[PDB]
């Protein structure tokens, strides 16, 4: 991560062992669930890329998913390389304008990444950019591990309603579909994929019933 | 290709 | 959260992993009990909205309840938007007056939320406002999960009195009814929903018996 | 509507 | 709680989640034993009333006991209100002289409670006053839960002496009786409520035997 | 009566 | 405990909940073993008397032992009261010269105890004095609970030597006997209280055998 | 007698 | 490790007991897995060689592996000794230019290692150099313990595909072979070492199929 | 331990309860294994003698070993007393030149030990000297508890090679024999104390085979 | 003899 | 040879 010192200078520090261990446990216990994408961010906020690399280099399992994360990091970088091309010769020995490998911490170091973050001009969040790319590869992995469908989910006659909705809104969160489609799915598909006449008890509500109204109407139905 | 298949993440 | 630096400036920091984990455990073990509403506040006091979002984005379950929390956040904001409408053109590039999305941290950032909190004039508690809205949606959820009634509760002949009162005052706390009604319920309904003649032993006390007098009078009765 | 149904809380 | 900043100013901070959790566990495992009254104080020393409220608002059980604590807080305040009546009109917008609700943190805020604690003149310990009132209601609760009597306790023939004394001095601590009565009870009742001739072995000691002399004299008797 | 029966402790 | 602030002033702070919990566990698991006397000191070093009181007021069991500790604190104080008698009238409102109750924290407060510790002249360690008195009462208690005798200990034919010595040096530590007696006991009694001819194998060593020489000579004998 | 029998240790 | 003090000076500090314990557990539970090499680095970042030595001197088991680490440290040093030979007589009593034993902390001390790190000129990372050498000996050990072959791995008919790939990419990471060979192995060997016709379902993809395309194509095949 | 304050002064502090507990657990779980000698050092680095005493006064068991540690501390001191004899009369009330009891903390205090460590001239590491003496007595104890011989160790026909080497290099570490003897033992005895023809498979290597070459050659032999 | 047999380590 | 076989890592 990064700290500050007298005079306005900044320094590098280590990533807490407690945070590294918590990242690993989140990956193992949740088996790359959707929850893993934000747990990573909170654990890594105020950090730098070198540390983000170590956390992802500690997980010794679910290694296929990590290759999926790697395929993504190489792409986003290529886009940045094209969008932010090598400027050319640089005056004196000034720090190089950041490129695809530098944001990740491969062709660079922590001191250079921290210097870029507070470069007097063009301070660049090298740390935040590499986490966004990483969250994209984690989300692809969360889907590959659990490819269950929102439509596939169906209610059971001796099975309650709250839990069916629970399975429904949890599956929808993982998806990366458009918000309006999510809105239609959460006002139509849920009423549709119920028990034969439980669809009717949900429809008792006049229209576009709010979920407070639907979770109370079918309590013990 | 920033990270080659199987390459530990980070500096080479 | 927020910290301070030399010169009177303020900065942003991360939300402790210990606090995120404790929020999740409070939600899972208590299954969104009433206790969850204040545990959230203590864990999140001195924080900012972005962090409150991450804690609520980590819980991977009880996702229906979270949609109920969302339906609430969108409403309270709309009220604020109407009460605090867009002023109009703003001089130079000053920070925008906060709106419904900004208080939540969606159409904004942490640095802007912290700057608003110490804006030299009109310092606004963007963090506290988003927690109050959130506590309203959590309370709706606590009720949906446990919709047991204060009147429904009844004492058993081989069942003690202290525990019946325990179930009674715990159920009353969750309710959002008026205080005078709560006062009547705690001086009448409790004596009424007892065993056939245990109502009489409670009434032995001259009138409006204090709970110290009622919990001791029927000990081993 | 600040947070659309199913939208992870926070920045878009 | 409270912290200090450069210039001599003071600020507010959050109550540790570790302390909130430890207060709850002390209440649950000891079932409101006498030990609970001081565990609360140590956990809450250097704190303010708002935090003391949250700790007591987190416990989701033993809710009847809490109502007993509330009946007490309302009384002690009324006494303070009478002893410290509203002075009248206050110059300019100075902070109001504290009243019954303010000491608890209900009709007030943390910043006002901290300002009172270091008010240049009449600095008032708003935090310590609300904890003393609370310790009085907790002690009433400790007694209601365990109403066993010091006299009720009796020794057994195959039961040892040290443990009987242990049950005796533990029960006496909970009581709120006068110290001289406690002194008489600890020099007479203990010798009296023994086995038929174990009373005699304790009396072998010339008179007013010290407990070192009594716990060694009847070892293996 | 500072805290009414059943009222969560603290600010109203 | 105590902390320091700019200008050379000193303040009071709370006693860690982790330290209070560790003191209780040391008392419960070791059942007031000799180990308890120094665990208390390490946990309480840099502290003040008020905190030492809370730790000893949290233990809810082994209450008889605590009365033994109290009988001791009242005595040592009386000695101090006689050795350090009330001086007489004190100029202006200066802090009172400390007495028996003040060292314990009963007729005093933490701020007065901290002021005494750094009184510009006669700085007095009020904290260390009350811990020494307390360690004397704890040691009496350690003996009352385990009154096994160093001489009572005897070796077994199918029982090893190292463990017998272990029981021997552990029992000797608890005793408060003179060092020369301890030296004689550790060069004579141990050889004497062995198996019939194991006394001889220990004596194979020419004289006053060192324990390294005795623990190796009878290995597998 | 600083601490009377059964008196919680500390201030009265 | 190292800290800084007023004036720009630097000091030495201890290595956290939590970090020493976590290094040992990583070695014991993972039995010197590949994960051990980076866990060591994160735990030891911002440290000095003396501390790295203690962590490796605490592990009381897997001692053969440690000798392998030692054989490596002696070699890398010899190379440095040759590359950086003793300069000759040094002016006054200036600190000696570092040699093979000094980087490890054997013929040196922490204060000398910290002084070298901030030597006004030629500041040398004595700490980072000794960790790189150590990571080379750990990697040799990870291979000796688990010498399973990437080619040896084969899929089972009732065994899934994701897990086979998991065993494949985990084994490849441990290897120290060239990246292009790793690329060929991850685009050919994996398709080859499958079930008799599962090789065909993977080949359904037109060519050089990306792992996202391969892990989804054979889901439930 | 020791801390620093403004002006260049130094102070004393307490030893962490976490460190005291970890020292005890290291002694109990490893039963005074070789690992105990360095765990002690890491836990006690930056400390003073008084604290080292408390840690060793908390362990309530393995008390015989501690007497062995004591026999050693008294000897090393006597040597220091002779090497560093009482100088004679000291000017004014200057702190006494340290002696055998002072280095241990018996005839001295922490403030005097800290003052010696930063004595403007002849700053002496009173803390490090007492730990080296202590590590010598711990090593004698590690040997007394586990007196198994490097030569006594023998391989089994259905027993693997890596583990035999593991038992061999672990036993050698505990020994305090010369390094060249250790080198001969690790290039000869290990090949000798194998299975009847496993000695030959190890010898397949041309000569002085490195342990990497020996641990791989006999894998699955 | 700095520490006599059985003497708790530290100040007398 | 910086560290001889079996030599505890660190200062001699
Ligand atoms: O170790 P960290 O990741 O920095 O976490 C700290 C740290 O925890 P430990 O006690 O486990 O080491 C503090 O202790 P120190 O490192 O400063 O000794 C502790 O507070 P104490 O010092 O009182 O033990 C504090 O606990 P809390 O969260 O209850 O304030 C805790 O906090 P975080 O885990 O939130 O960082
Ligand atoms: O980091 P620490 O302060 O050392 O505490 C953690 C953990 O607590 P935290 O994660 O909250 O810090 C344990 O508590 P739990 O989380 O398991 O409840 C705690 O032990 P206790 O349960 O007895 O409090 C133990 O440290 P310590 O014993 O010094 O308190 C340690 O455990 P882990 O390293 O396994 O997280």
Numbering used by the authors:
A (entry chain A), C (entry chain A), E (entry chain A), G (entry chain A), I (entry chain A), J (entry chain A): 1 to 221
B (entry chain B), D (entry chain B), F (entry chain B), H (entry chain B), K (entry chain B), L (entry chain B): 1 to 12
Please, what does the article write about this entry?
With reproducible assemblies of HIV-2 CA amenable to a structural study, we sought to resolve the binding of FG peptides derived from Nup153 and CPSF6 to identify differences in interactions compared to the HIV-1 capsid. Following cryo-EM analysis, high-resolution structures of the HIV-2 CA hexamer (2.98 Å resolution) and pentamer (2.99 Å resolution) in the presence of the Nup153 peptide and the hexamer (3.16 Å resolution) and pentamer (2.82 Å resolution) in the presence of the CPSF6 peptide (residues 313–327)86 were determined. Similarly, CPSF6 FG-peptide density was readily observed in the FG pockets of HIV-2 CA hexamers but not pentamers. An atomic model of 11 residues of the CPSF6 peptide could be confidently built. Interestingly, we observed a clear interaction between two Gln residues of the CPSF6 peptide (Q319 and Q323 of CPSF6) with backbone amide groups of the HIV-2 CA. Despite these and other differences, the mode of FG-peptide binding for those we tested appeared largely conserved.
The capsid is comprised of approximately ~1,600 copies of CA molecules, which oligomerize into ~250 hexamers and 12 pentamers (capsomeres) to form the distinct fullerene cone. In this study, we leveraged the approach of templating the HIV CA lattice assembly on liposomes, together with stabilization by the small-molecule host factor inositol hexakisphosphate (IP6),75–79 to produce regular HIV-2 CA lattices. We report the first high-resolution structures of HIV-2 CA capsomeres in their native mature lattice using single-particle cryo-EM.
